[PDB]
Design a protein around this ligand. Sequence first.
Ligand SMILES: CC1=C(CCOP(=O)(O)OP(=O)(O)O)SCN1Cc1cnc(C)nc1N
Ligand SMILES: CC1=C(CCOP(=O)(O)OP(=O)(O)O)SCN1Cc1cnc(C)nc1N
Ligand SMILES: [Ca+2]
Ligand SMILES: [Ca+2]
Ligand SMILES: [Ca+2]
Ligand SMILES: [Ca+2]
Ligand SMILES: [Cl-]
Ligand SMILES: [Cl-]
Ligand SMILES: [Cl-]
Ligand SMILES: [Cl-]
Lengths: 311, 311, 282, 282
Amino acid sequence: GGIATREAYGKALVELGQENPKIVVLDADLSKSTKTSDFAKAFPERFFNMGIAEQNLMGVAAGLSTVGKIPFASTFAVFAAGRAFEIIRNSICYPKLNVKIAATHAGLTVGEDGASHQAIEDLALMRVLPNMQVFVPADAAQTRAIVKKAAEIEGPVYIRLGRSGVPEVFSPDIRFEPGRGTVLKEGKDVTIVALGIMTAKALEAAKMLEAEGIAARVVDMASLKPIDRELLVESARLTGAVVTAEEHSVIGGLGSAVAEVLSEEYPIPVVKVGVNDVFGESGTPQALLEKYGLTARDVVAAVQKALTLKR
Amino acid sequence: GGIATREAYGKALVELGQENPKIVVLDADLSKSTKTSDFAKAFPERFFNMGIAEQNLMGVAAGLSTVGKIPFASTFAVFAAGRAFEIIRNSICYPKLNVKIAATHAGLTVGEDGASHQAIEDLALMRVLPNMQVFVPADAAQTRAIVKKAAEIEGPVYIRLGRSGVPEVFSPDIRFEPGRGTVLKEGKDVTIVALGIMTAKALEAAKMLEAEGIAARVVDMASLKPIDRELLVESARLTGAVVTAEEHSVIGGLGSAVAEVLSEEYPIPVVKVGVNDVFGESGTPQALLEKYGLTARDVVAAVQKALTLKR
Amino acid sequence: DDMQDEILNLKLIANQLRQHVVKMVGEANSGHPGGSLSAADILAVLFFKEMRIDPANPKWQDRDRFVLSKGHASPVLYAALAERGFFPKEWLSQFRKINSPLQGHPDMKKVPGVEMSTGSLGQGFSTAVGMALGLKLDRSPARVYVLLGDGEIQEGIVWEAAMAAAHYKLNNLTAILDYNGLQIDGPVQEVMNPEPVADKWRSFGFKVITVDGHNIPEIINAIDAARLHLEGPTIIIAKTVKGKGVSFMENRVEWHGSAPKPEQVAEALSELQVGREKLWEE
Amino acid sequence: DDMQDEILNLKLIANQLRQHVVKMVGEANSGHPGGSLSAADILAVLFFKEMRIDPANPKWQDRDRFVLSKGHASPVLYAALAERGFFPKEWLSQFRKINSPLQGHPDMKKVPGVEMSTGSLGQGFSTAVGMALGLKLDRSPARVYVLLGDGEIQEGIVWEAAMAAAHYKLNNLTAILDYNGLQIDGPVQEVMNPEPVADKWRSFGFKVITVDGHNIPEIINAIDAARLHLEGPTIIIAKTVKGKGVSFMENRVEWHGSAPKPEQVAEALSELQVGREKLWEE
Ligand SMILES: CC1=C(CCOP(=O)(O)OP(=O)(O)O)SCN1Cc1cnc(C)nc1N
Ligand SMILES: CC1=C(CCOP(=O)(O)OP(=O)(O)O)SCN1Cc1cnc(C)nc1N
Ligand SMILES: [Ca+2]
Ligand SMILES: [Ca+2]
Ligand SMILES: [Ca+2]
Ligand SMILES: [Ca+2]
Ligand SMILES: [Cl-]
Ligand SMILES: [Cl-]
Ligand SMILES: [Cl-]
Ligand SMILES: [Cl-]
């Protein structure tokens, strides 16, 4: 029972605004919902609402980055990654400009707004962009570490955030390093690689597996791009089987990124837990996670399948 | 040397217009270049130029599809897949509307217009959309078969097309079936899976390999979504090693699709020939393919690497 | 007077739509009362007088079409479609619930009488231009009605669609702007000012008619004037009160997307029922 | 006096830019002569009179900025930057070649003096609004000049960017429209008519000045009027001839994106050299 990653983001932005006069923040009439509203209240002269205009949001952010500002641009993930995709591509990533995109309301945990608002594709879109770094915090502590690191990095960054409160995984002392994943639990039988809301569920699955004599390694991979290739290969050598778990399509996200690495370096089973190439629907976050197979019990089922496939 | 896939597309549209009264065609001030100009001349009453307005191009196509028309919407791949991504997502794919997107000038073979125009991400974007089918013709004969099939099937289709003349691969008798790939050559040592311009280069690489005692199977996978899972597993069981070859980023396209399938079903090496997570640049098509590693000799080098990993 | 009785009946239907909106958002614990209540008189006129539609023939090829481009106002569309007989009124009690047909934004594949899946702002308007283009090609007598928000017109696709509707002479397209002055982060003039709004629509080739969006005779007269304008499309700029009909919601930014608690549903229904009893006095 | 000598020198520079455009597109076998030649008088005025820039200090924080939103006209920008001394004139002979800095569309990380990587229509204008917003916050004396095409203004992002520039009162942004009437598939009025163009820009909150885009004194005077207007942004609508200066290219749709063959380069340079000799007569 921790705060939402969007709430941790809003507080981290105010901290950055206090530390660094070059930070500016933009939104697209969703400041109340993304939690850029905290910064908007503290620093109104460095906050720019662009109205309901996500293509121009990202173009204006690109231009601000060339006048000595470090812009954070926010809206919901479907609109940030998708409506503005080709502006991010040609005005931010190609020229390698210093823009941070902090997109909230990703995944099914958006809930009742339903399919048009539930981003299940945003990691596929941001991972394919050259020069983009893609970071997916698990909880409030890792959100604060990732937001502060994104402000220090020179170049494009996408931070994926969520609507709903999520359980604590990391301590307040967490240090975020791009290209490094974290072993949260050791085990010889299988590795569960997860990010976002699925990291806490992977730890719950690992407790359920221990109760039936299966020892799962659990890896958090908030750093989706650049991914921790060395930790994936180490996990493959130790355990011989991987389950991936993501609040995202099984196409083009974490499962895809892990399959790409291990198929070229150390080929082993990679069984993917995620949204099965469908759109979502309106419902409570918990009812949606149950229906679409994003629960600890679904991770346990995927581990049982992976164990039948391993050498 | 054969005609460009865009030229085969423009001729196939006229053939459809002669036999199918429901076909309508839209462009975004690139009719001269996409070759929708052939249909525009033959059936001006069913041709709609939307000007330089790709979001509205796709929304107007969606609306036309609800009044019993079968729209083909064209522009360059970077603008079709990227500028209009979220309109394709929320007005076409979510409601499963009967819109065909035929996007030309994909890949590096665009040439001198350079990085902003060279689509290296479009297959990753279209593959992650639920309800989207993604078809990538190798040559003129397969382009004609794919365009005619797209008009017959119900629902969203993305057809990826190119600028320049490409070699003949398929016979005039070619039959296209969504979800089915084609074995173009048998071999026990390795499988090369290719689509688009890379299929002809895979066949040239297989001739070079035969000369050094390596027997390569060559598979065309124009049907990227739905992919031919059964043919990939058959190929993996026969040969124990795969090279994928695509005029696209190694992230999220054919290499990704094949790694996802084989990591779930029959883990083997998958060595990926493609653009190495970079943007392109201005140059002649041939100079760009050489610099960015998209030649038959690069496929030969990838096969030698894959064979080092084969069990 | 059949015309005076017709107007009273439309005011009673608008009141019923408002009562449905408050109850269904309350029960869902989720949804958009302010921008639903602002549009209730417009949807009463469209669904109960002006549109040619048949719930016994929802795929009638020459039917008039309504597109809710501001798709978050799904409660007022669902209330109208239920009262017109497109689906059971019992569906309204499962708004925004898992497995319910009544999604938070309209899904054309799940709800009879929903003509487009909307919810991404600007997109419904672009699809409405495509519908009008195809119906013009098919010599249909159909009219395409589309409701826009005044925050929504900050989207570039709206101006692309407007330019295209003028170029293709789509006089069968009638746009309506819910001109309530508010969006999520504040008044539209503070967030991203679209004024002068009528001058923008005229410069994009639309006839502009300004009405009081809570005056049913003015809305009826504006729709008749749109029908008679043949050079191209018309937009009806309908000045409205966000949260119209509920005292504590009227002109309040914070009632955009917040569900009333049971005590607030009871208060709102009491006000609307007092309003309704006063209409039964006429 | 010195004013009339100043104007003659700008006409000679514009002629030199046109000669560079024809030669570099011919040598590349690729590029966009029509929309490069239409803009040569505008870029002569900006790069050789009005803009405060220093080729020895290309990242001077208070420099004026030029954004080529219609990025396919890169030949005329590269000709101007080479003649101003930002990089060697020898670079012009490797336009659009592999491993060469002069990309087909401007690349800000490869070419000194290029302020934004452009080529995707509408995007450069949006970035220019962001530059002006940041420079206004820092109270920089810098001006942001941005050149748009008249096909380019069919993009929705242009109208989003215009609405934002008016809302944020960006008087430090001067837009220029290359109003040549042509795009790829034909005249703009046939493909997707943006008229009435001046009414659209006024309705989006811009001051509008109309000039002959081949009249150097009118361009200078319009830039001064924009500078003196402190309340908000200005757009200069510059009526131009696509292919201006080359008889067989003038007002021709087909010279948008086609490279002249050597016989056509020779003919075009002969006309421009005859034009240049006539200027040396004044
Ligand atoms: C900002 C925003 C809203 C305010 C509308 O404001 P409006 O048009 O003025 O509507 P109103 O009649 O006052 O209720 S809703 C939903 N949303 C998020 C939203 C943002 N971007 C896109 C593309 N689609 C959305 N759905
Ligand atoms: C249509 C098109 C062009 C005509 C411009 O026409 P214009 O603005 O009127 O330019 P002009 O001054 O007359 O040369 S160029 C390139 N292009 C393809 C093109 C399409 N879409 C996007 C987003 N970027 C592009 N680059
Ligand atoms: Ca309730
Ligand atoms: Ca509003
Ligand atoms: Ca030449
Ligand atoms: Ca033009
Ligand atoms: Cl920790
Ligand atoms: Cl064949
Ligand atoms: Cl009422
Ligand atoms: Cl000249």
